[PDB]
């Protein structure tokens with residue numbers, strides 16, 4: 687599913703991400719935009735051989751099991767395929783774990799390079815939320 691901007695804002699709010707660990711909703715919508723362009727099905731292979739999955743591009747070296755990243759931790763205890771669903775609950779729940787792991791949202795390198803320090807509030811402009 688390719689979400690629309692306000693539809694994704696509304697689903698992420700509903701799953702408790704607005705202000706989760708201090709990060710307002712515009713941060714999470716900006717991260718999904720540049721990580722996956724709002725597409726739940728996005729996968730990207732990494733040079734260490736891991737693959738990043740879904741809307742928030744959660745990586746298989748640490749967070750999910752895809753059966754082909756040797757010696758990866760599966761900290762969200764989820765097959766990586768679960769993160770490509772049209773329903774974002776698995777992605778939001780694993781993201782909540784990731785953002786609590788000591789480095790906040792700097793774990794999403796498109797957030798750090800394209801959203802961090804910008805007016806993220808523009809990402810939820812106009813949405814009935």
Ligand SMILES: CC(=O)N[C@@H]1[C@@H](O)[C@H](O[C@@H]2O[C@H](CO)[C@@H](O[C@@H]3O[C@H](CO)[C@@H](O[C@@H]4O[C@H](CO)[C@@H](O)[C@H](O)[C@H]4NC(C)=O)[C@H](O)[C@H]3NC(C)=O)[C@H](O)[C@H]2NC(C)=O)[C@@H](CO)O[C@@H]1O
Nearest residue numbers: 732738742743744745747748784787788789793794795796
């Ligand atoms: C090609 C490219 O850039 N791809 C990225 C892809 O790599 C992105 O996925 C991210 O990858 C990085 C690197 O593997 C992940 O960062 C590491 O995450 C672990 C777990 O949190 C960090 O370990 C933790 O570190 C803190 C202190 O630093 C400790 O207190 C914790 O206890 C410790 N946890 C454990 C279990 O040890 C580690 O330090 C990070 N390493 C670095 C170099 O930052 C990152 O989590 C991962 N992000 C996601 C969302 O999965 C992906 C997303 O940006 O997109 C691009 O594909």
